[PDB]
């Protein structure tokens, strides 16, 4: 009854991968076209520099994994965010992996890096201005990094909040708080959560 | 530890005491030093509801506006309307303005009433105000030009719906979110207070 075209997942940000593949594998069996993930926020730039270099160290390992395995598995990678804040090293690797995988049909992984929803909205507003378009919901929407509405917004962890992730896109997103101390989760419980989603009533106001 | 300046509330919009429970929420806000209480009455999308449903909602809203004309200023509660008010019938707009004017000076609690309101629309309207003022289009400027500039600390959903439904999206970027599965009527002061206590002890990093 409900179509899940766009699934957005965020995991706890408190000061492993299996869950991520299980994640991607399921979006696929389920015919979920867009998977959106939150890696690094605009506000995260204020963290302690140690915590940051550590996160980009992880990120870098993730991107390497993307290059190797994304194309042959027919997965696409797209980076959203204010990417200009990023070091050239990462930025290049990103650009590369996007280009390598640009032609993948089976799933689209939207990776949010140096990303914030308020920044996105501001940037989108400007895109609109510089095209000499009327400022309205529709033109703004179409000029986001990610125009696509979120259907299911999924928090893997104990934090109850959006933390500046795809706000605009979430106006009518179904929200789901899946508690854990460990960003863990099972193929089935995903499918469980999904099932739940398809059945719950969406009125879009 | 966490301070709660701005409480937002939305109840399930699908399928008396209500007035009594509301007083308790308002008393709890005062007792707790919550300066702002934000309520969701009618949204921009709600306009696509059957005409009979819209009719009934404005019928009640009217009833509530009257209560507020009666009870608000003598309790030092301020009322503010947000949303695109230009979409409202004349009789309504004026009656809103009336209670607004009458309670404009009220110090103790500020009740923000979202009527013909949508977050996306609020956001667009804020961007035009910034442009119209020849300000730079940035986060801070857009914030300050919202109908309601104040960040939401706690977003409380009363009902079974799990979603924000175009309610104060910008303000909620880092808002703590809480789903209480009950009807509004069934809520007690003790419960409001508890939920509040819970929010106060939650870890808020704002991205660190
Ligand atoms: C591995 C990698 C590149 C990034 C790790 C991202 C993870 C697992 C969580 C970060 C989530 C973000 C950006 C915000 C969530 O904020 P919160 O949990 O609500 O404080
Ligand atoms: C009594 C009165 C004047 C208005 C009542 C507002 C109520 C009870 C529900 C409407 C809430 C709104 C505007 C949106 C929530 O929609 P949803 O529950 O997410 O489908």
UniProtKB/Swiss-Prot annotation, chain A:
Enzyme Commission number(s) of this protein: 2.5.1.-
Cofactor note: Binds 2 magnesium ions per subunit.
GO biological process: polyprenol biosynthetic process
Binding-site list for Mg(2+): 12, 174
Cofactor or coenzyme needed: Mg(2+)
Location of the active site: 12, 44 (proton acceptor)
UniProt keyword Magnesium present: yes
Coiled-coil parts of chain: none
Domain of life: Bacteria
Transmembrane feature ranges: none
Gene3D superfamilies to which the protein is assigned, alphabetical: Decaprenyl diphosphate synthase-like
Stored Pfam families: Prenyltransf (PF01255)
Any one GO MF annotation of this record: magnesium ion binding
First-tier enzyme category under EC: transferase
Residues binding substrate, per UniProt: 13-15, 41-43, 45, 47, 155, 161-163
UniProt keyword terms in alphabetical order: Magnesium, Metal-binding, Transferase
InterPro entries named in the record: UPP_synth-like, UPP_synth-like_CS, UPP_synth-like_sf
Family of the protein in this entry: Belongs to the UPP synthase family.
Self-association state and partner proteins as the record states: Homodimer.
Job description of the protein: Catalyzes the condensation of isopentenyl diphosphate (IPP) with allylic pyrophosphates generating different type of terpenoids.
Protein name per the record: Isoprenyl transferase
Species, as recorded: Campylobacter jejuni subsp. jejuni serotype O:2 (strain ATCC 700819 / NCTC 11168)
Lineage: Bacteria, Pseudomonadati, Campylobacterota, Epsilonproteobacteria, Campylobacterales
Protein's gene: uppS
UniProtKB/Swiss-Prot annotation, chain B:
Binding-site residues, Mg(2+): 12, 176
Disulfide bridge positions per record: none
Active-site residue list: 12, 46
Catalytic class of the enzyme: transferase
EC number: 2.5.1.-
Cofactor note: Binds 2 magnesium ions per subunit.
Cofactor(s) annotated in UniProt: Mg(2+)
Entries under InterPro entries matching the protein: UPP_synth-like (IPR001441), UPP_synth-like_CS (IPR018520), UPP_synth-like_sf (IPR036424)
Biological processes per GO annotation: polyprenol biosynthetic process
Cited Pfam families: Prenyltransf
Keywords (A to Z) from UniProt: Magnesium, Metal-binding, Transferase
GO molecular-function terms, A-Z: ditrans,polycis-polyprenyl diphosphate synthase [(2E,6E)-farnesyl diphosphate specific] activity; magnesium ion binding
Keyword Magnesium: yes
Binding site for substrate: 13-15, 43-45, 47, 49, 157, 163-165
Function: Catalyzes the condensation of isopentenyl diphosphate (IPP) with allylic pyrophosphates generating different type of terpenoids.
Family membership: Belongs to the UPP synthase family.
HAMAP family on file: ISPT
Summary of subunit composition and partner proteins: Homodimer.
Protein name: Isoprenyl transferase
Organism of provenance: Campylobacter jejuni subsp. jejuni serotype O:2 (strain ATCC 700819 / NCTC 11168)
Lineage of origin: Bacteria, Pseudomonadati, Campylobacterota, Epsilonproteobacteria, Campylobacterales
Chain's gene name: uppS
């Amino acid at each position: 009854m409900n179509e899940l075209k766009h699934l957005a997942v965020v995991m706890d940000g408190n000061r492993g991968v299996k869950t991520m593949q299980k994640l991607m594998e399921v979006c696929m069996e389920e015919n979920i076209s867009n998977l959106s993930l939150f890696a690094f926020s605009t506000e995260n730039w204020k963290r302690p520099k140690d915590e940051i270099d550590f996160i980009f160290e992880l990120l870098d390992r993730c991107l390497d994994e993307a290059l190797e395995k994304f194309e042959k598995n027919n997965v696409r990678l797209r980076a959203i965010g204010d990417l200009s804040r990023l070091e050239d090293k990462v930025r290049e690797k990103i650009t590369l992996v996007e280009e390598k995988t640009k032609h993948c049909d089976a799933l689209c992984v939207n990776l949010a890096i140096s990303y914030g929803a308020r920044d996105e909205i501001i940037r989108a507003a400007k895109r609109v201005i510089e095209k000499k378009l009327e400022l309205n919901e529709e033109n703004l929407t179409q000029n986001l990094d990610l125009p696509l509405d979120v259907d299911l917004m999924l928090r893997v962890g104990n934090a109850k909040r959006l933390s500046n992730f795809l706000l605009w896109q979430c106006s009518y997103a179904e929200i789901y708080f899946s508690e854990t101390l460990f960003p863990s989760l099972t193929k089935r419980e995903f499918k469980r959560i999904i099932k739940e989603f398809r059945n719950r009533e969406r009125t879009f106001g």
